[PDB]
Amino acid sequence: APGGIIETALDIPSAIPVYASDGSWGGPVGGWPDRRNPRAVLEYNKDNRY
């Protein structure tokens, strides 16, 4: 798991959805905090296999 995923899941506001309304990945917008969807970070990580 990438460094601090949980610690990123906990300071991401609950208003930000997991999925956007076309079915891609949710994220912030406008003034909401500069911080990425953890669930999407876990997806983009899922083949980094040693």
Partner 1 sequence: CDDFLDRQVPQGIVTGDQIASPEYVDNLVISAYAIWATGDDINSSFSLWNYDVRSDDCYKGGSGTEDGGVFNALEISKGINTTDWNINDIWKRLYQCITRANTALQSLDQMDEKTYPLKNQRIAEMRFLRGHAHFMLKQLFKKIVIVNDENMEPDAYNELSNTTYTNDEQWQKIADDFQFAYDNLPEVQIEKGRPAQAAAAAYLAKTYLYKAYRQDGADNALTGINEEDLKQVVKYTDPLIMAKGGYGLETDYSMNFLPQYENGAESVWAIQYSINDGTYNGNLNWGMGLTTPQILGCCDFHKPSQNLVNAFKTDSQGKPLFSTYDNENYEVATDNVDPRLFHTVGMPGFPYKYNEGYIIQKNDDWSRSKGLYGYYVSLKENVDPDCDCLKKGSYWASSLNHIVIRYADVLLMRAEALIQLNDGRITDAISLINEVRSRAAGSTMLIFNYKEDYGVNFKVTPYDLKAYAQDEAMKMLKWERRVEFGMESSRFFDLVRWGEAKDVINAYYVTEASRCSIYKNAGFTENKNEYLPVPFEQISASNGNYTQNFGWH
**Quick one: 14 or 49, whose CB is closer to partner 1?**
14
3 binds partner 1 (CB under 8 A): no
The residue from 30, 47, 49, 50 that contacts partner 1 (CB under 8 A) is: 30
Non-local (6+) Cβ contacts of 33 within 8 A are: 11, 12, 13
The residue from 7, 11, 34, 47 that contacts partner 1 (CB under 8 A) is: 34
Provide the Cα torsion 16, 21, 23, 25; round to 10°.
-30
Contact residues: partner 1, CB under 8 A: 29-34
